[model samples]
Each structure stands twice: as C-alpha cells, then as structure tokens.
Target: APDSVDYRKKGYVTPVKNQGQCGSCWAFSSVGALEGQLKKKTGKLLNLSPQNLVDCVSENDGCGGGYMTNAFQYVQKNRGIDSEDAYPYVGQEESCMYNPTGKAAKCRGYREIPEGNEKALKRAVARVGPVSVAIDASLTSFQFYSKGVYYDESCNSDNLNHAVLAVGYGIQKGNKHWIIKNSWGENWGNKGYILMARNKNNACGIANLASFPKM
Candidate 1:
C-alpha cells in the first residue's frame, strides 16, 4: 500500500456536511461511509440522507445519540436509503416520514476494524474507502480546533462520544495524521474537516469503533 491516501482528491468522498445542534453525528458518519462506497460502485456521488437514519432507525435514539453499527444495520434491513434531497435533515428527533421516491444507495453490509488498532484502521481507510469512526470529541480544543494536526495528551481513548469519518491518512512534516471529515459545517475545523494525530495509540478513540459500509 502507499504511505498515504486521500479519498477526497480521488473523487470517492463527498462534500462535508453539518449536523447542527443535534447529536446526530452518528447518522452523518454512517451516511458518509455509505456515500463513499456507493460512489465507488456506481461512479456517481450522491448525498444520502442521515435524517432517514435518525428518524427511521428505531433501535437508535435519534438525535439524542446513537451508534454507526445500528445505523448500518437499519439501512441494510430497509434495503436502501433515500437521498438528502428527499429526506432533508431537521437536526432533531421527529416522527419518521421516510419516502422512497429518491432511494439512491444500498449496502450489502459493514465491516468493523479491530478495536484500538491504528494500523488496521490505516489499512481500512487506505483500501476500503471511507470508514465511520467514533471518537472523544468532548474536549474544548477539539470543539474549537481550526488548523494544524490536532493532538491532545489529555484526550481520552475510552470515552468515545462523537462520530466522524476517516477519509484518508498521511504524514505531515514527520507527523502522521488521519484526515477526518466532521459534520460541523464548513466554518469549523479546516473547512468541515480535521487532521488528528494518527499512530499515537489511537488518539481520541478514533479506532475504537471504526467500521465501513460494503457496497
């Protein structure tokens, strides 16, 4: 494998999105992974709806909080998911109004990387498209992160709270990092993205619950 890879430049990843004030980060992460796999399979990038998962995935807590694995399972069972334009996000828990009119992407299943292993996470991101990952985003530095490779010694590995997508990995001036796509909009963190310190014992629990959709 190459020492570095960027799915954004490769045209497999979609544009960054915003999750608003809700804790629907898991939904965004799940859709981001599915979008990447769908684009790779169909050669067309379409924005899948996270609102569908937030409202339809009965097992999850909607905007309160959720897990990516459950979201993927929900999509797999539902056969497929509709586009963002069909089920626009409201950023809050609402009654399910799923419409199949614009159903665009489907996944065979999903695969989870070994817990706490950054090497396996790197391989998955490099070879398996974008991967949905959960991390500890409870720190102030992370909330206000703007530029540069983010690394905090105080970052907790076992307290994963927020979900994001690992779109690529690379080294910057001898500093290895993972390029993460966040759902905080374009105004935050290097234009809706952040480069977290990689190969440093899974900084911020990035590899703790990593998984990706299979097209």
Candidate 2:
C-alpha cells in the first residue's frame, strides 16, 4: 500500500454527515463507507440513507444501536439502498418507511479488515474506500476533539463502542494516524474528522471490527 492516501481527496468519500441524538452511529458509518465505495465503483457521488437502515433493517436495533456487519447483510438482502432524497433522516425511530422501489446504490457484499492490523486497514482504505470501524468513543477528550493526532491513553481498544468511518491515513509531523469521519455534524472535531493514532497496536480498536461494503 502507499505510504499515505486520502479517499476524500480522490473523490471517493462523501460530505460529512450527522446522526443527531441517536445511537444510530452504526448506520451512518456503513452508509458513509457504502456511499464512498459506490462512487468509486460507479464514478458518481450519491448521498445514501442511514435513516432507512435505522427504520427498515429488521435485524438492527434501530436508533438504539446496530452493527456494520448487520447493515451490510441488510443491503445484500434488500438488493440496494435508497438515497437521502428518497428517505431523509429524522433522527428518531419511527416505523420503517424505506422504499426499495427507488434505490440510490447497491452492494454485492462486504469484507472485514484484519483485527489489530493497521497496515491492512491502511491498504483497505487506499484500495477499497472508507471502512466502517468500531472504537471506544466514550472518552471525553474524543467528544471535544478538535484537531491533531488524538492519543487517549484511556481509550480501550478492547472495549470498542462507537462506529465511525476511516477515510484516510498519513504521517503528520512524524506521527501517523487514520483520518476518521464522525456523525456528530461538522461542528465537532476537525470539520467532523478525527485523526486517530495509528500503528499503536490498534489504538481504540479501529482495526478490530473494521469492515466496508463492496459495490
């Protein structure tokens, strides 16, 4: 893999998204990854729907919480997913309003990134697109993260909780890190991006349960 690569700079990653006050981070994470990969595969940028997954995917727990693997299974079963235009997000779990009749993007399958492997994760992001990852986002410093390489000694790689997207990776000031996209809106982090510490034995478990869909 290349020493550094940015999927966003290569026109693969989509604009930052917000998940509002819900535990639907998993939906947003997979949606972002799928959108980016779909664009890379089709040469078109589409804003997919996380709300549809939150509402429709019967295997998921809706706004309460879900998993990236489960989200991929949902898309595979549904054949394709609708766009944000067709199924806008309301940040709350109502009844399933997903209309498969009109789809924005679809995927054949998904693959997982090797657990505790940063090099493999980097290659996946550079070659595949954004990767959905689970991390211990419970740290307070993470909540107010602004810029620079985030190194939280308290973040447990084993106790991964929140789901986010790894869009890029590079070395900054001799410090290597992964560029992460959050669903907390643009007001948080660096325009809703976080530079999680990389090559540090899977800091925050970013590589633990990482996976992205194939378009």
Candidate 3:
C-alpha cells in the first residue's frame, strides 16, 4: 500500500485522555481508533479511557510497550468489554476497582497491514476505523509540521514518542495524502495528533492494526 496522499481539512478528534505517566499509548490508539469506528458505525460517541484498557486487559505487557494484538486478545477473551465508568482508568496504577465484568466487546473486525501500505491503510480505515501506527518523533511528522499536509519518513529505531490513531486522510497542498488522529493532550502536534505521508503499503506495522468491529 504505497499510495501517497495529503489530507485537505484535518479535524480535531476528542482522544481517549491519558494520564501523565501511562505507557499505554499503544492501547489508546487501538481503543480510541475503535471508538471512532463504533461511533462512525453506530453513531454512538464514547470517549473511553486508555487506562481502562491497560488495566482491564489481561496482557499486562503494556507499560513495557506491547502489541495491539495483545490488547485485542485481552478484550476478546473477556467477553464484551467494560467502560471506564465501570472499569475506572487509573493511569499506570493497578488500583482500578471499577471492573464491570461482562462479555468482550463484540468482536467486529480489524486490519493488520504488513508495516507500510497506504492503500491497505485507507482500506482498513474505510472498512474499520483509524489505524495505530508507530512513528519516529525525530521526523518531520513530529517536527516542523505547519498547518495542512505533513509526512514522516524517519521510520526506524523506535524514536516513537507516541502512538496515534489515523482517523481520516485526503490530498492537499503539494503532497499526496495522510492518515489523521489526535495525540495526548489538546496542545500538541496537529492539535494533539498529526498525519503520515499517504502510502498504503508505507505504514503497515508502523500503522499497527486497524482494529475494530464493536460498532
């Protein structure tokens, strides 16, 4: 999926708020993107906490930086998942006493592109929701992004300062298109998140899994 692109109008998506010390960036991207999928599917707007996913999920390999598949495994095995209101999000602490046990969040679907494939990614988002991609914070995607279009090629060595959800994308400016989403707070890159150079096959594992279905 090596189709290039540059989204025209980027939107501000309310991300799943992460506390100051949580290392569940991967979890949030997975879940947050799914939330967007569900909302886009069922029209149900839900801003869940990533901390909830981090704590509720069995695969405690998080904080140490784990895979999105593991997070999905945790949710699928536990039946329909629980909301933060019930599970409670406590950042990095294991003191969450808000477990509202039930069946896993009904498995809908997901797309795990190789490591880079803008086309596959576009397809994934079209089929599911935003994608979770690994990026190098040292790249232009992290730095120097002005307003509309942006790209990041510095993909190597885990300079990943954050994991983000790719909500939307389109062509604009003098570039192709990109995958879009938000970041941590509401005052970071592209209003919290930025975009990646459109290349269907360019952000596979980097894009991680385009996981969803609960919608």
How do the residues 1-215 of candidate 2 rate in per-residue lDDT, one tens digit apiece? Answer: 44887887778777888888888999999998888887887888888999989998888899889889999988988888999989999999998777867688888889988878878888888788789999999989999888899988888988877999998898887889999999988888999899989987788888999998987
Instruction: Estimate, for each residue in 1-215, the C-alpha lDDT of model 3 and write its tens digit.
Output: 34433222322244436445667777777666556654665555555556656765666554656566666665556545555555656667474343546222434445467544456667765555555665555555455564665544445533455566766666655455555554456565566655556653453234543444344
Q: Rank the candidates by TM-score, best first.
A: 1, 2, 3
Q: Against the unseen true structure, what C-alpha lDDT does each candidate score?
A: 0.90, 0.88, 0.55
Candidate 1, 103-127: lDDT as tens digits: 8888877889999999999889878
Q: 161, model 3: CA deviation in Å?
A: 6.4
Reference-based TM-score of each model: 0.97, 0.96, 0.75
Which residue pairs show backbone clashes in model 2?
A: none
Sort every candidate by lDDT, greatest first.
1, 2, 3
Q: Ten-residue segment with the worst summed lDDT in candidate 3?
A: 4-13
Instruction: Output the lDDT of residue 175, model 1.
Output: 88
Over 4 Å off, model 1? none
Cα deviation of 40, candidate 3, in Å: 3.7
Query: Of 1 and 2, which scores higher on lDDT?
Result: 1
